[PDB]
C-alpha cells in the first residue's frame, strides 16, 4: 500500500504511520465511506500485524460520531494530540525517578527513552539495564541510543532477567495495547519479567498512549488473537502485576483503566 | 504588659579575631544563615513583641542587613529597634544606657547576637513572675540552663561552670568558671547557713539566656565596676536573689569559639534544633530554598551534581 514509504522517520511508530496514511488517503473520495475506511484499515493491518495499529485505526475512524468539510479537519488535530501525548506522558512520568536509582527495561521504546531523557534533563543520576531482546536485537540499539545521553547503560541477556532483578529499583516498559481488565500487551519477554518483579516486590510501571486501548478480555496466554502473536512475538500480562500506568489521560491504576476504555466508546 | 527583649549585637570579646576585620561575628553564616537571624527567629518564636538591638562596632553593616531581613517588614509581630553608639565597651555600658533611657518597663530577656536556640519560655517566666510577686520583688534574675553531659562536644572547657543550687526552690548560690581548674572549692556559707537542699550540679550547659528585671539595670548602674554578666552574678551572691531553670527536651547554645561554632553547626545540620532546620527556610528568603533528602542530605536549586560524586552523610 503506502505505509511503507512513510517509514522514513524512525521516531514515529507504526500505528501513527497507519493513522497518517489513512488521513492522507482520506482526501481521495470521488454512508458508504464507512466501508471504504474499514477496507483501508484492513489493508493497513494486513501488512503489519499489531494490536496498536488496529486500535489506532479504529479510534481514528471513530470521529464519524458535499458534507466532508467537518470530517477532514479532525485528522490534523488528532495527529497533533498524539504528538503532544508523548511529551505529556514524559512530564507526568519523569517525577518517579530518584537519584542513584536503577532502572530495568525490556526492549526499545520511544516513550521510555523520552521519559529517561526528561529525567536526565531534570538533573538526575540513574543506571539503565536493557534486555538484549534475542528475537530481534532492539535492546542493544536502545542502549546505543542512550549511550550519547551520558547515561550509564548495560545490556543483559533475556535469560539473565531474574539474576539482576534484585539490583533494580523500578521497572518501566512500554505497551503495544491495553486490554479491558487492566493488563498490557508487549514483547514476548515481558510477562516473566513482571512475574519476577512481583516476586521481588519491585514496582512495575507501564507507559502508553490513549490510542492503544483495545477492547480485549483475555484470561490466559492462549486467549489473545492468533493474528496478533504472529515463535510468538506478543504475550499477555496480568493486571495484578502492574503497579501504575502513565497515560496522556493522567496516572491511572490498573482497576481504573476499564472506566476510561468504556468512556472512550472504542 | 507586652514582652520585651534586649539584644546585644556586638560581642566585646575578640575570640573571633582572625577574621572579624571585615565582617562582624553576628553576620558569620552557620548554615548559610546569619547568627543574628537565628536569634531574631528564636525571640519571635518565644513570644517577644519588641526587640532592642544595640550595635557598637561595624554598626552600619548590621543596620543595613537588618532592614533587608523579614523581621523589619511592616507585617511583623516583633518590632526591632536598632540603637547605635560608639561609646559602648561592655554589656554593662549598654545596660546602663538602657537604665538611663528607661526603655524597659517590665520583665525582659537579655540575650546575645549569636545565640541559637528553640526554647519557648512560657513556664520559666511564669514561675519567675510568681516568685517575684509572692516575695515582693526579691528575685531579679532567672538564668536558663540545659541539662547535658560533661563529655558532650558542645561543652567547651572555656564555657564550663559548676553551680550549687537548692533542691526545694531553684536558686543559684554559687557561680564560678572551671577554666584551668582541677579541684573546685565551694564556700561554707551554704552548708552552715541553710539546709533542705544544698546539692551541687555539674551537668548544666550555659545557654546564655536570662530573664531580667527592671531593677537589674539599676543595680548595674549603681556599681560602676560591672562589665559582663558573670561579674554581676558573682558579685550579687556576696552580700536580691538569682534563680535558675533547666530544660530537658529543647536546645540552646551561644557561639563563642571555633570549636563551639562547629559543634553548633553540626547540631543544626542534624536537625537537633528542630524546627529551625535548613530546609524549613525560616528566613523567608528566595535564595535559601532547599529540599531534604535521605541521610540528612540537603540540596538547593541548581546543584548541578556531577557523575561519580558520593554524599556519604549530611551535606549542605
UniProtKB/Swiss-Prot annotation, chain A:
InterPro entries: eIF2B_alpha/beta/delta, elF-2B_alpha_N, IF-2B-related, IF_2B-like_C, NagB/RpiA_transferase-like. Acts as a component of the translation initiation factor 2B (eIF2B) complex, which catalyzes the exchange of GDP for GTP on eukaryotic initiation factor 2 (eIF2) gamma subunit. Its guanine nucleotide exchange factor activity is repressed when bound to eIF2 complex phosphorylated on the alpha subunit, thereby limiting the amount of methionyl-initiator methionine tRNA available to the ribosome and consequently global translation is repressed. Component of the translation initiation factor 2B (eIF2B) complex which is a heterodecamer of two sets of five different subunits: alpha, beta, gamma, delta and epsilon. Subunits alpha, beta and delta comprise a regulatory subcomplex and subunits epsilon and gamma comprise a catalytic subcomplex. Within the complex, the hexameric regulatory complex resides at the center, with the two heterodimeric catalytic subcomplexes bound on opposite sides. The keyword Transmembrane helix does not apply. Its main location: cytoplasm. GO terms for molecular function: guanyl-nucleotide exchange factor activity; identical protein binding; translation initiation factor activity. One of its GO terms (biological process) is response to glucose. This is Translation initiation factor eIF2B subunit alpha. The gene is EIF2B1. It comes from Homo sapiens. Coiled coil: none annotated. SUPFAM superfamilies: NagB/RpiA/CoA transferase-like (SSF100950). The keyword Transcription does not apply. Activated by the chemical integrated stress response (ISR) inhibitor ISRIB which stimulates guanine nucleotide exchange factor activity for both phosphorylated and unphosphorylated eIF2. Keywords: Acetylation, Cytoplasm, Disease variant, Initiation factor, Leukodystrophy, Protein biosynthesis. GO terms for cellular component: cytoplasm; cytosol; eukaryotic translation initiation factor 2B complex; membrane; plasma membrane. It is found in: Cytoplasm, Cytosol. It holds the Pfam family IF-2B. The modification N6-acetyllysine is found at residue 27. It is linked to Leukoencephalopathy with vanishing white matter 1: An autosomal recessive brain disease characterized by neurological features including progressive cerebellar ataxia, spasticity, and cognitive deficits. Brain imaging shows abnormal white matter that vanishes over time and is replaced by cerebrospinal fluid. Disease severity ranges from fatal infantile forms to adult forms without neurological deterioration. The disease is progressive with, in most individuals, additional episodes of rapid deterioration following febrile infections or minor head trauma. Belongs to the eIF-2B alpha/beta/delta subunits family.
UniProtKB/Swiss-Prot annotation, chain B:
Acts as a component of the translation initiation factor 2B (eIF2B) complex, which catalyzes the exchange of GDP for GTP on eukaryotic initiation factor 2 (eIF2) gamma subunit. Its guanine nucleotide exchange factor activity is repressed when bound to eIF2 complex phosphorylated on the alpha subunit, thereby limiting the amount of methionyl-initiator methionine tRNA available to the ribosome and consequently global translation is repressed. There is a cross-link at residues 21, 63, 101, 177 (Glycyl lysine isopeptide (Lys-Gly) (interchain with G-Cter in ubiquitin)). The modification Phosphoserine is found at residue 90. Changing residue 155 to C: In VWM5; with ovarian failure. It is found in: Cytoplasm, Cytosol. The chain holds residues 41 to 361 of 721 of the full protein. It comes from Homo sapiens. This is Translation initiation factor eIF2B subunit epsilon. Component of the translation initiation factor 2B (eIF2B) complex which is a heterodecamer of two sets of five different subunits: alpha, beta, gamma, delta and epsilon. Subunits alpha, beta and delta comprise a regulatory subcomplex and subunits epsilon and gamma comprise a catalytic subcomplex. Within the complex, the hexameric regulatory complex resides at the center, with the two heterodimeric catalytic subcomplexes bound on opposite sides. It is linked to Leukoencephalopathy with vanishing white matter 5: An autosomal recessive brain disease characterized by neurological features including progressive cerebellar ataxia, spasticity, and cognitive deficits. Brain imaging shows abnormal white matter that vanishes over time and is replaced by cerebrospinal fluid. Disease severity ranges from fatal infantile forms to adult forms without neurological deterioration. The disease is progressive with, in most individuals, additional episodes of rapid deterioration following febrile infections or minor head trauma. Phosphorylated on serine and threonine residues by GSK3B; phosphorylation inhibits its function. Belongs to the eIF-2B gamma/epsilon subunits family.
Amino acid at each position: 500500500y503506502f505505509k511503507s514509504q512513510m517509514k522514513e522517520d524512525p521516531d514515529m511508530a507504526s500505528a501513527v504511520a497507519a493513522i497518517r496514511t489513512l488521513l492522507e488517503f482520506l482526501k481521495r473520495d470521488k454512508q458508504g465511506l464507512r466501508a471504504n475506511l474499514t477496507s483501508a484499515i484492513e489493508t493497513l493491518c494486513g501488512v503489519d500485524s499489531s494490536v496498536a495499529v488496529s486500535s489506532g485505526g479504529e479510534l481514528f475512524l471513530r470521529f464519524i460520531s458535499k458534507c466532508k468539510k467537518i470530517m477532514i479537519e479532525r485528522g490534523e488535530l488528532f495527529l497533533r494530540r498524539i504528538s503532544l501525548s508523548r511529551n505529556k506522558i514524559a512530564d507526568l512520568c519523569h517525577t518517579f525517578i530518584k537519584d542513584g536509582a536503577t532502572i530495568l527495561t525490556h526492549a526499545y521504546s520511544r516513550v521510555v527513552l523520552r521519559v529517561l531523557e526528561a529525567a536526565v534533563a531534570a538533573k538526575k543520576r540513574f543506571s539503565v539495564y536493557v534486555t538484549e531482546s534475542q528475537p530481534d536485537l532492539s535492546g542493544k540499539k536502545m542502549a546505543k541510543a542512550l549511550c550519547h545521553l551520558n547515561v550509564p547503560v548495560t545490556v543483559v541477556l533475556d535469560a539473565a532477567v531474574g539474576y539482576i532483578m534484585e539490583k533494580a529499583d523500578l521497572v518501566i516498559v512500554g505497551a503495544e495495547g491495553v486490554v479491558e481488565n487492566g493488563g498490557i500487551i508487549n514483547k514476548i519477554g515481558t510477562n516473566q519479567m513482571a512475574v519476577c518483579a512481583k516476586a521481588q516486590n519491585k514496582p512495575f510501571y507501564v507507559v502508553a498512549e490513549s490510542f492503544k486501548f483495545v477492547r480485549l478480555f483475555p484470561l490466559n496466554q492462549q486467549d489473545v488473537p492468533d493474528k496478533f502473536k504472529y515463535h510468538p512475538w506478543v504475550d499477555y500480562t496480568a493486571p495484578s502485576l502492574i503497579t501504575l500506568l502513565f497515560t496522556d489521560l493522567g496516572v491511572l491504576t490498573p482497576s481504573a483503566v476499564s472506566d476510561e476504555l468504556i468512556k472512550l466508546y472504542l | 504588659p507586652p514582652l520585651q527583649a534586649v539584644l546585644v549585637a556586638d560581642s566585646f570579646d575578640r575570640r573571633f579575631f582572625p577574621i572579624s576585620k571585615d565582617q562582624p561575628r553576628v553576620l558569620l553564616p552557620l548554615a548559610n544563615v546569619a547568627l543574628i537571624d537565628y536569634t531574631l527567629e528564636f525571640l519571635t518564636a518565644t513570644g517577644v513583641q519588641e526587640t532592642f538591638v544595640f550595635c557598637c562596632w561595624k554598626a552600619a553593616q548590621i543596620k543595613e542587613h537588618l532592614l533587608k531581613s523579614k523581621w523589619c517588614r511592616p507585617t511583623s509581630l516583633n518590632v526591632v529597634r536598632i540603637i547605635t553608639s560608639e561609646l559602648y565597651r561592655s554589656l554593662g555600658d549598654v545596660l546602663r544606657d538602657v537604665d538611663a533611657k528607661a526603655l524597659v518597663r517590665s520583665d525582659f530577656l537579655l540575650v546575645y547576637g549569636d545565640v541559637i536556640s528553640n526554647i519557648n519560655i512560657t513556664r520559666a517566666l511564669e514561675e519567675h513572675r510568681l516568685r517575684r510577686k509572692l516575695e515582693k520583688n526579691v528575685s531579679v534574675m532567672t538564668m536558663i540552663f540545659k541539662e547535658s553531659s560533661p563529655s558532650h562536644p558542645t561543652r567547651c572547657h572555656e564555657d564550663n561552670v559548676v553551680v550549687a543550687v537548692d533542691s526545694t526552690t531553684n536558686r543559684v548560690l554559687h557561680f564560678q568558671k572551671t577554666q584551668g581548674l582541677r579541684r573546685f572549692a565551694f564556700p561554707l556559707s551554704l552548708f552552715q547557713g541553710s539546709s533542705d537542699g544544698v546539692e551541687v550540679r555539674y551537668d548544666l550547659l550555659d545557654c546564655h539566656i536570662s530573664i531580667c528585671s527592671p531593677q537589674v539595670a539599676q543595680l548595674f548602674t549603681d556599681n560602676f565596676d560591672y562589665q559582663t554578666r558573670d561579674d554581676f552574678v558573682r558579685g550579687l551572691l556576696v552580700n536580691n536573689q538569682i534563680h535558675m531553670h533547666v530544660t530537658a527536651k529543647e536546645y540552646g547554645a551561644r557561639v563563642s569559639n571555633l570549636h563551639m561554632y562547629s559543634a553548633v553547626c553540626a547540631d543544626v545540620i542534624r536537625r537537633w534544633v528542630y524546627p529551625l532546620t535548613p530546609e524549613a527556610n525560616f528566613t523567608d528568603s528566595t535564595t535559601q530554598s532547599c529540599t531534604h533528602s535521605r541521610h540528612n542530605i540537603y540540596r538547593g536549586p541548581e546543584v548541578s551534581l556531577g557523575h561519580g560524586s558520593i554524599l556519604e552523610e549530611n551535606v549542605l
